[PDB]
Design a protein around this ligand. Structure first.
Ligand SMILES: CN1Cc2cc(S(=O)(=O)N3CCOCC3)ccc2N(C)C1=O
Length: 126
């Protein structure tokens, strides 16, 4: 079995910015979600080999996780907050698509998403 390469976290041709919203996404949103009790399954790319989920990357073609998001924020990969917010939403949606409703992992993602949305409705301006 084989995992795909992780999503891109470095690209010298991609334009970058450090905005107040992106700083907030790292300092408040990511920081808070990362230390949540249910963060651990989302702190790295889904390891389909280790978890014995050989169909995962057949079903999920746009993988995302908070480890990748953390790298993107810390290494100034983004041009804007929308890109980052989309990464969070992709992470949640992938989880809901792949896993059965009411699976533990889904309940965990839902708890993180609830927190995420509370933090996001208080972003600074752009
Ligand atoms: C986000 N994850 C990570 C993951 C983790 C695991 S897990 O680590 O076995 N696990 C199951 C119970 O909930 C806690 C996490 C199983 C499947 C996945 N897949 C399919 C994902 O969607």
């Amino acid at each position: 079995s084989m995992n795909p390469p992780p999503p891109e976290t470095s690209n010298p041709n991609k334009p970058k910015r450090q905005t107040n919203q992106l700083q907030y996404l790292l300092r408040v949103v990511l920081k808070t979600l990362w230390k949540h009790q249910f963060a651990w399954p989302f702190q790295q790319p889904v390891d389909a080999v280790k978890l014995n989920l050989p169909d995962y990357y057949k079903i999920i073609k746009t993988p995302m996780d908070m480890g990748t998001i953390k790298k993107r924020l810390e290494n100034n990969y983004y041009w804007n907050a929308q890109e980052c917010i989309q990464d969070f939403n992709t992470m949640f949606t992938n989880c809901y698509i792949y896993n059965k409703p009411g699976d533990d992992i889904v309940l965990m993602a839902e708890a993180l998403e609830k927190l995420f949305l509370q933090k996001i409705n208080e972003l600074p301006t752009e």
